Every structure is written in C-alpha cells, then in structure tokens.
Amino acid sequence: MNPKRIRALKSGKQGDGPVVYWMSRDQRAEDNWALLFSRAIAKEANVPVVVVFCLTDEFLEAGIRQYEFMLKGLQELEVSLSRKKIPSFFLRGDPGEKISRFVKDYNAGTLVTDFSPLRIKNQWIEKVISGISIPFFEVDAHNVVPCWEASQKHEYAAHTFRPKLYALLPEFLEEFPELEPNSVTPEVETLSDVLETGVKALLPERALLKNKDPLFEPWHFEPGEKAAKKVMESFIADRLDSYGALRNDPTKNMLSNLSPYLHFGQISSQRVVLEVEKAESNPGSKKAFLDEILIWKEISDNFCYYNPGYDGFESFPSWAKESLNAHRNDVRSHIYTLEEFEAGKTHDPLWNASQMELLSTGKMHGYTRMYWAKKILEWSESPEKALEIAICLNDRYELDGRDPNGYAGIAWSIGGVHDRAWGEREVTGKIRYMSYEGCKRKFDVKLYIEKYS
Ligand SMILES: Cc1cc2nc3c(=O)[nH]c(=O)nc-3n(C[C@H](O)[C@H](O)[C@H](O)COP(=O)(O)OP(=O)(O)OC[C@H]3O[C@@H](n4cnc5c(N)ncnc54)[C@H](O)[C@@H]3O)c2cc1C
C-alpha cells in the first residue's frame, strides 16, 4: 500500500458512513489500487465500502460496440463485487449531480475515485468537488507508476521517459494484496434494463452497409474480467515469442489484443507486466512488449496530464507547428470529407482496408493506425481538420477509443508528438512520412486488403 498512488483532491470532515468508490476508468474487482485503498480506509474507519458507477449522457457520442462491451463487463463486475459483500450502485445522469446526491443520501464518509487525465473526467471532478464536504481522494490504478510520480513535466520523447519509469519500477511494480470482503452487508436500476434502453437510443446511428446489415462483428473480443485473463494467458503462451518480429505485420494477429480490456480497465496493466516479467521467452520480444504497455501506454497519460490541449494543434512541438505552418498553403493532392473518410471511399486501397477493419472489428491494427492517421493529415485542408477527423473516427469506432493512448497516438502521427523531425516534404512538412510503397516492403498489403473487402 504505497501512499504515493493516492492523491487528495479535497479535504473535509469525514462522515460516519460508508466509503464510496467512484469507479470510472478501472472497471475491475481484482488488481484495483483504487478499490484496495478504499477498502483500507473503510476498514480503519469501522465502516463498509461501496462502489458507484455513473452512466453519463455522453454514451450517445459513441456506438453500441462500446456501450455493450462496457455494460456486459459491469454485469460480470456486479457479480464479483457481490461475492465480496461489496454493493455496487449504478447511477444514470450527470456525475456532478448523481454523486453529490448519493453522498448526501447515503451519508458517505469518504469519496474515492480512480485517476483519468481526460478533460471530461476533470469536468466531473470540478462539479463533484463543489457539491460535497467530505474528503475526496483519487488513486492511480491504471499506471504502474503514478502519473504524477513518474515525471513532474511533459516528456517530449520516449528515451527521456524510459529511464525515469524504469528507475521507479523496483518500487511500484509489486504484487496485489487480496481484496478483503466487507464484514457485514450494509444498507439505480438493473443493468440489463439500462442496456436495452441505451441500445434502442443508439440504433439509428448504428454503422451499417448497403444491405442494412450491421458492420460490427462482436465475436472478436468477449468482454469481462474473466475474458481479459484468458486473452492475457493466450498471448503469453502463444504470441509473446513472436511479438517482437511480427508486431508490425497487420496480416498476422500476433498482438496481445488487450487494449479494449485495458481501456475500460477490465484488466490491470501491472498484472500483465508481472506475468510477462516472470514468463521466459525471447528477450527481444519481451523488451518490445514492455516498451509498449509500460513506456508508450503510460507516456500517453503523461501527455494528457501535462498538456491541457492534448487534442489541439497547440500541444504539438515547436518544430512541428512551425513545419506545418510553412506548408499550410501547399496544394494537397486529395481532399476528402469526414463522410468519405468514414465510409472508406479514398483512392488508397490500403487505407480503406484499415478503415474497414476499424468498422468491422472495432480494433484496427497498431501498424495501420500509424498509416491511417498520417494519410488523414495528407488528405485534409489543414492540420486542425486532420486532428478533429482522426479523433472523431478513432473515438467513435475504436473499442479502445476515448483513451489517452488514442490522443497521444494521433498527436504522434499528425503533429510528431514524441517523435523527431524527418526529411522535409510538402504538405506534411517534417512529420514522419509513411508511403504506400514503404508498407509494401514491410508486409503483404495484398493479403490485408483482401481480408477486409
Ligand atoms: C492513430 C492511432 C490511434 C490510436 N488509438 C488508440 C486508441 O484509441 N486506444 C488505445 O488504447 N490505443 C490507441 N493507439 C495505440 C495503439 O495503437 C494500440 O494501443 C494498439 O494497437 C492496441 O492493440 P493491442 O493491445 O493488440 O497492441 P499491443 O501491441 O499488444 O500493446 C499492448 C498495449 O501496449 C499499449 N500500446 C501499444 N502501442 C501503443 C501506442 N502506440 N501508444 C500507446 N500505448 C500503446 C497499449 O496499451 C496496448 O494495449 C493508437 C495509436 C495510433 C497510432
């Protein structure tokens, strides 16, 4: 129980009622530092711990693919917390109003939530803080090393954040203590009812094709805390050995496929790191996978935390803002609208195959994601339009969308964030360029195109 994982958002008078855990980003019962610290505070106060989840009005800004994945996991989570005598309350509406009412109605003594550097999460905290008088804590249950402890500033490169994160690994990379159940069961609708209503409201915006059939294939990633563990065990036993040599081959499914579970917090990355470190395989493949789940994943939280405008052109490096500004008036070879990018109606078959995989599976390959967003910059009227188009298609169709990884991954491709300057080209400027011929020399582009017609 390292006290550096928990930060105080607002001090106040601790009430004589239960400790309330505000689950937002880490929807899981095991390996949850936020839930564990809530159980410790509750035990020292001689009071049980409760879990609350808010079903916000922003769910309609996404699709059914993300609403069903996250609600089906909550149905499994409600069972697991029930086995620990931990009641879970699911509220619908504004967190600033539903939590401020839950705290006063249930006589909350302490409020705890998990950490998320997103702007929407900071909006809820501001509304909640002004409506409560009890202590307010937050816990970094998503990163191995707390985001405010790994670095005190924004790291402009990976080679500057890697020594800082690895130097703190011997302290924060530890095993998880068991979640002690509540002593006695203590003293707002069914999740299946909220799922049917939410789907009926989202159906008119469902992604379809010509024959009115749905585009999403939900049999690729089963949601839940139990399904995340099976995926982790399959990757370590079957795909971890070849990850280093095939992570850039979209025609091979050699990736861990853990991101949708990682985004919703259905599995803890620290648990994944612990299992991989004890696994004996290719050292080059292990070093490559850890550089993705530790360095690049937690540097995305670092990027969103220390850059308020992480989704804007202002967060780009000075060399990239000046390079893009010098090529703003360059005549673009193509200009596609958001509807053409969404439907995959560009002249690039490789790009359309990446967009069709996104629409069909909700998880586009990591390598094509770099090509997918860089061509949005090349075929847009301005870098700002490319950012908004890339963010829209990402957050809407990616199962791991609306994530700090997504915003840091798009800032890297369009604005060179966490990258360096390359040869100066037109339109794109000094941003790293990925050509269609370059992808042909890296993998079989024909097999990837034919797989997603
Ligand atoms: C344009 C673009 C958009 C992106 N949008 C998303 C997004 O919406 N959501 C999202 O979680 N990630 C996004 N990524 C990061 C990355 O593409 C995915 O995390 C990765 O492809 C997820 O599939 P995986 O779990 O099988 O990858 P793996 O190769 O098995 O890696 C495991 C984990 O390492 C992390 N990771 C790997 N690569 C990156 C990376 N480049 N940046 C940050 N973390 C990484 C991820 O958490 C990932 O789950 C984006 C990257 C780009 C270039």
JSON list of C-alpha atoms in Angstrom, two decimals, residues 3-12 110-113 125 129 134-140 148 305:
[
{"chain": "A", "resi": 3, "resn": "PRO", "atom": "CA", "xyz": [0.80, 6.16, -0.26]},
{"chain": "A", "resi": 4, "resn": "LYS", "atom": "CA", "xyz": [2.20, 7.74, -3.44]},
{"chain": "A", "resi": 5, "resn": "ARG", "atom": "CA", "xyz": [-0.53, 6.09, -5.55]},
{"chain": "A", "resi": 6, "resn": "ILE", "atom": "CA", "xyz": [-3.24, 8.21, -3.87]},
{"chain": "A", "resi": 7, "resn": "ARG", "atom": "CA", "xyz": [-3.72, 11.98, -4.12]},
{"chain": "A", "resi": 8, "resn": "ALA", "atom": "CA", "xyz": [-6.09, 14.24, -2.18]},
{"chain": "A", "resi": 9, "resn": "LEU", "atom": "CA", "xyz": [-8.49, 16.27, -4.33]},
{"chain": "A", "resi": 10, "resn": "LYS", "atom": "CA", "xyz": [-10.38, 17.98, -1.49]},
{"chain": "A", "resi": 11, "resn": "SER", "atom": "CA", "xyz": [-10.08, 17.79, 2.29]},
{"chain": "A", "resi": 12, "resn": "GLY", "atom": "CA", "xyz": [-13.12, 17.80, 4.53]},
{"chain": "A", "resi": 110, "resn": "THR", "atom": "CA", "xyz": [-15.13, 9.46, 2.21]},
{"chain": "A", "resi": 111, "resn": "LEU", "atom": "CA", "xyz": [-15.18, 9.66, -1.59]},
{"chain": "A", "resi": 112, "resn": "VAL", "atom": "CA", "xyz": [-12.57, 7.84, -3.69]},
{"chain": "A", "resi": 113, "resn": "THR", "atom": "CA", "xyz": [-12.18, 7.65, -7.47]},
{"chain": "A", "resi": 125, "resn": "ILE", "atom": "CA", "xyz": [-14.37, 16.33, -10.54]},
{"chain": "A", "resi": 129, "resn": "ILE", "atom": "CA", "xyz": [-15.95, 18.96, -5.53]},
{"chain": "A", "resi": 134, "resn": "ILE", "atom": "CA", "xyz": [-16.33, 15.03, 2.71]},
{"chain": "A", "resi": 135, "resn": "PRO", "atom": "CA", "xyz": [-12.67, 14.20, 1.90]},
{"chain": "A", "resi": 136, "resn": "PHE", "atom": "CA", "xyz": [-12.03, 13.48, -1.78]},
{"chain": "A", "resi": 137, "resn": "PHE", "atom": "CA", "xyz": [-9.16, 11.21, -2.83]},
{"chain": "A", "resi": 138, "resn": "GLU", "atom": "CA", "xyz": [-8.02, 9.86, -6.19]},
{"chain": "A", "resi": 139, "resn": "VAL", "atom": "CA", "xyz": [-5.85, 6.81, -6.88]},
{"chain": "A", "resi": 140, "resn": "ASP", "atom": "CA", "xyz": [-3.79, 5.94, -9.97]},
{"chain": "A", "resi": 148, "resn": "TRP", "atom": "CA", "xyz": [2.35, 12.47, -11.05]},
{"chain": "A", "resi": 305, "resn": "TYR", "atom": "CA", "xyz": [-1.95, 15.10, -17.86]}
]
